[PDB]
Design a protein around this ligand. Structure first.
Ligand SMILES: O=c1ccn([C@@H]2O[C@H](COP(=O)(O)OP(=O)(O)O)[C@@H](O)[C@H]2O)c(=O)[nH]1
Ligand SMILES: CC(=O)N[C@@H]1[C@@H](O)[C@@H](O)[C@@H](CO)O[C@@H]1O
Length: 238
């Protein structure tokens, strides 16, 4: 029985060093109720992950480094490679960036209701209480991620997205079609990683919208307490 939770994680290249503290924080804060089984789906090129030889929930998946911009553009194309084992092993899906870190215990409060659409979005830390006129949406009608001015509620970031497995997999398949449709039209959506997810969140507003506290950049001073910290990529330790 219990509730199955799946974590989508990509750390190809030099971002594999972010897995250690992320895993140690997820095992201490993220879903530690007795009704939660947590599964790690790590997409990397590293031959072995941290605590992989001890933990069985850590699924090392073959994935080379695609570089820019395919590492953020073809992100959802990677998730569909194992979409056959995702719905059978998980009930909820969650995507976190590499350099993310848990600081506060996260429970069932971020779980979308059973009646709603079952989607999850996170407000961008750079756009809090800023007007719609300052949103960096895709303003080209030729692209599939096009959002006209005046429309939209929040500016969702691509650093953190989730929801139930059934609704989240449809989200991935929808965007993948939007990427390939733009590839044929010789056009690249901007910003590809977050503009595409805002177009979907406009057509399909998420059940619950997380504050930028779950995407708090390290060093900033934002009007909320940091729950999930975006670690600085340019630190001497990294
Ligand atoms: O070589 C790379 C570059 C990026 N990422 C992933 O892409 C996400 C966003 O990275 P970002 O675009 O901020 O890095 P940049 O492309 O600016 O170097 C992160 O969660 C990384 O895990 C990756 O796996 N390998
Ligand atoms: C790198 C990051 O956190 N993402 C975005 C970046 O892509 C760009 O949209 C910028 C200005 O809108 O806001 C952030 O820095």
């Amino acid at each position: 029985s219990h509730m199955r939770i799946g974590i989508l994680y990509i750390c190809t290249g030099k971002y594999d060093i972010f897995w250690k503290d992320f895993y140690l924080s997820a095992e201490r804060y993220f879903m530690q109720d007795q009704s939660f089984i947590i599964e790690y789906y790590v997409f990397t090129d590293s031959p072995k992950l941290y605590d992989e030889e001890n933990n069985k929930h850590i699924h090392r998946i073959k994935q080379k480094n695609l570089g820019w911009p395919d590492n953020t553009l073809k992100r959802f194309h990677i998730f569909l490679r194992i979409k056959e084992q995702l719905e059978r092993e998980t009930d909820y899906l969650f995507f976190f960036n590499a350099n993310l870190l848990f600081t506060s215990p996260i429970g069932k409060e971020i779980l979308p209701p059973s009646d709603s659409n079952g989607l999850l979005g996170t407000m961008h830390p750079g756009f809090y209480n800023k007007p719609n006129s300052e949103f960096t949406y895709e303003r080209r009608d030729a692209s599939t991620a096009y959002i006209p001015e005046g429309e939209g509620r929040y500016y969702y970031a691509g650093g953190l997205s989730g929801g139930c497995t059934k609704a989240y997999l449809k989200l991935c398949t929808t965007i993948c079609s939007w990427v390939d449709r733009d590839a044929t039209n010789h056009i690249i959506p901007i910003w590809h990683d977050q503009s595409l997810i805002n177009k979907y969140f406009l057509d399909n507003p998420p059940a619950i919208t997380l504050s930028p506290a779950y995407l708090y950049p390290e060093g900033w001073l934002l009007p909320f307490e940091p729950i999930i910290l975006i670690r600085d990529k340019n630190k001497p330790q990294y």
